[PDB]
Symmetry: C3
Subunit: 365 residues, 3 copies
């Protein structure tokens, strides 16, 4: 039988438990989430800076789809499936400046940067060849909140419909987003269900016992997790730390947005880090951890901070979700886990997980 | 349809064939054996020495279950699933001395060494929190014959009920078991069904043509394979060998015990080797090959003997079961293989396989 | 439901599309092709030279079957499944000179080079032992066109019935086949469905934009693709090239033969290259690329030509089929691809793919 959840699941965060374990492991559940969620939701893939000039392009992979996003020669941003309409060879790789046409490496069909077939050698001698039905196949792309979202659902509306108020709130958290520049990217294929990874972001319960240096800057004594409409916001005061961030009143901002992209405006509010979750299968999630600074020339504090994120901070969260994925298959882990919400909605309250899982639940009725 | 065997399968070792090949490869058969056998049988995991002191612990993995076995501060031996009752993080890794409490690396819940939840930060502010239903989840553990068995079946009786007479017989084979100390462990994930591996132990037919040095010490001319009640015993005379064991009348003892742990009391009778089979899936078996000596300081003969087991002896049996697993999927291997039992029950008689497979058969009615 | 194709599929190459994508990826489709095609078709495995002397043997692996082909002491060529009739251990490995008997490494049963059981130790003391039903299990083998084919279907006729006229045509393309000697073998497990790989051979559309040096010798301006009866022939003029073949009127011959072996008689017509496709699963194909020269002592031109094939030529075709396999799973690749046939049947016409896929289609009614 299809694994279905009650609509009220996690509707009361004061008395709630995570999903039954079959939702973090089941291949059947993933195929449903893959199609009902990730193929019909707006997926954040990059900061605007990576696509701000004509011919700039990037490629991404999410739920088995190789996607190209490319700023046309006409400065129009478009996105395409990265597969040739003739025999299915891939078209571009990596990121960079596209040439003025896209030439498929197999049979050298050409496409304008708008996906239109330009020249397909010998096509005028092939009977009934359909040039207009031989273009690159597009999908939707939207620049929102200074970032770039794709949608595989032709009928999708816009990213504001999916995250009402988010751009408005993020621009109050960070006023320099348009100026940010990608400083560093950690790519990691992570053996954990995408929802386990959102779980791990939605709470600060684990800060003290898992993250020394971070918990020393970001004071979770003054910390609140507000829920909204398909996103939430964690904010807290902070001070200079020699185990994380160093050097008036520093602040921390942590937005989770549906389905699984998270935006961080750490202390100082002049830079961002962004976690991108690109699910592969039920126990596999590709993660981008991006560090953005407004200056292209990095200071040492920024580079050192980068290495701190790579070697110290991120490995503690990688190690955590990977062990959780292993443990929740054990017959000793009885089904579900308790979400440690408190009435006060304290800094260590886990109520964030319940808002998230209640939304997920609506895709399993 | 479910693959079922006749109850008389291999009930007459004089005229018997191994399982139809689907029993060494089928994923469906493994899931049944995993649940009907390995989750309801006593599984040997270690010698008593590894758990003789308060706070000593070991971890094992069998049929997808990470297990912790730990001698309490109160000297009581217990075993637990190695997963935290809160979010499912794993609790301990490796082996060693546990601290006085078990602290989960994720959210720092604490547990006494008896599994009881000690302190779960913020729990007194979570509504309806169930502290007694938040302890580590236990399973059964028993010290028998100087070794340690776990059972995932709450209702299990004891290891003597599963191997009647075995401790009695093993203590006559080796009188120094309580004094043994783990001298060396070879860990190998082996691409062979667990039953293929028992198959390879249950006969001496292959000694001559596969194991020069061993067959030169253990004379299989004076060799008998006795069956009992869920175990069997292979014993034979031996002499000093410069290709295996060197330096009144040396003896060899080889006990197979249900489902798949084997105890060896090689010539001299003052040490043991033990094969532990921890099945992973239908074509995958984790193996521990343990060498135990009563002295902690190894002589060179013992260390050299260890290396002999690692580099010479064990690889010949690893290579054998791995090729068999490959070969029995071939359409040229017609279904089953003949068990070369002789009327005399000679040293090279394969009748041991039939006793084993007849017992396995009782789980496929 | 079973994926079935119309019998007329690709019967009109002027208006045709490749298979719906499920035929290059489906596990169910592969199991059918594996059994309805590869277990009932003649499979080319080697040149005659590798098996021309008594006791010469080779092993191959195709669709999960380890096969031994061995020239008896009596000079009779035979083929066997490479698995022992007793316990299923593999019998021979690699290629070389077999001893006068085949001794199984496990229990030392012996077999004459004709598969007959010779001596099975202790067999005269095993009740009802069936020596005649304990021989190596054979399959059909045929030397045709100077090469060696196996057939897993006991009832198969001969290779000429499956490729009428092929030996006759190949001997007109190359008159020195009996003199060829294996100069080099590239083994590659390729992540592409076997049909994708045949696809890539059946056309010259991609020569210009994917293979500089080759397209500079083999002029595809004078190039024709003739279809026949379960094989096709691509031939073209050529000239000396410093980017492929160097140094009266050079010719190129390229035979595809059912199901997926291809024979090349490149310019000069004094050597051959042969592609052997041994499918593993729906997205996996083992490939042998063999270079044959009539001299055992290689000149430098020949060795340099070999390295050209290894490092330059073959990687461009490996990279192509591997990207195609990735791309055709994308939801952006809409189902099928157009086969760029022209009325003229030009050198770049893709009509070859349609002949091939029409034959494949007959196995999915
Ligand atoms: C939201 N919070 C603070 C729990 C997680 C961190 O923001 C993770 C991160 O900054 O990369
Ligand atoms: C029982 N017997 C002798 C066949 C197998 C060997 O005991 C294997 C071993 O000693 O490790
Ligand atoms: C038939 N053709 C020329 C398209 C493919 C090439 O023969 C491939 C090869 O020579 O290895
Ligand atoms: S697959 Fe792109 S041009 Fe042929
Ligand atoms: S998972 Fe163990 S304390 Fe939270
Ligand atoms: S498996 Fe070949 S002799 Fe036993
Ligand atoms: Fe964290
Ligand atoms: Fe052995
Ligand atoms: Fe090519």
């Amino acid at each position: 039988a299809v694994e279905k959840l009650p609509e009220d699941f996690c509707a009361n965060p004061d008395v709630a438990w995570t999903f039954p374990k079959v939702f973090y492991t089941s291949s059947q559940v993933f195929e449903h989430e893959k199609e009902a969620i990730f193929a019909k939701s707006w997926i954040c893939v990059a900061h605007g800076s990576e696509l701000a000039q004509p011919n700039d392009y990037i490629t991404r992979k999410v739920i088995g789809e190789n996607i190209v996003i490319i700023r046309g020669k006409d400065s129009v941003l478009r996105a395409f499936y990265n597969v040739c309409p003739h025999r299915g060879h891939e078209l571009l790789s990596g990121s960079g400046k596209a040439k003025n046409v896209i030439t498929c490496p197999y049979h050298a069909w050409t496409f304008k940067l708008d996906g239109s077939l330009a020249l397909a050698r010998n096509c005028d001698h092939v009977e009934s060849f359909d040039k207009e039905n031989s273009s690159m196949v597009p999908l939707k792309v939207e620049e929102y909140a200074g970032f770039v979202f794709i949608n595989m659902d032709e009928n999708a509306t816009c990213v504001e419909d999916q995250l009402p108020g988010f751009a408005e709130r993020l621009n109050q958290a960070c006023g320099v987003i348009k100026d940010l520049k990608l400083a560093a990217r950690f790519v990691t294929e992570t053996p954990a269900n995408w929802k386990v990874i959102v779980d791990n972001y939605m709470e600060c319960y684990h800060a003290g016992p898992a993250h020394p240096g971070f918990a020393d800057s970001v004071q979770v004594d003054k910390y609140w997790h507000t829920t909204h409409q398909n996103w939430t916001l964690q904010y807290g005061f902070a001070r200079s730390s020699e185990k994380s961030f160093k050097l008036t009143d520093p602040e921390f901002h942590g937005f989770w947005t549906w389905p699984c992209t998270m935006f961080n405006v750490p202390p100082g509010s002049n830079f961002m880090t962004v976690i991108y979750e690109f699910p592969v299968d039920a126990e596999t999630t590709l993660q981008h951890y991006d560090i953005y600074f407004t200056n292209e020339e990095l200071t040492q504090d920024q580079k050192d901070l980068i290495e701190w994120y790579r070697n110290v901070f991120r490995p503690e969260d990688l190690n955590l979700v990977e062990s959780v994925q292993r443990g929740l298959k054990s017959r000793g882990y009885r089904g579900q886990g308790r979400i440690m919400t408190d009435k006060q909605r304290s800094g260590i309250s886990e109520h964030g997980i319940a808002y998230f899982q209640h939304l997920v639940a609506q895709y399993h009725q």
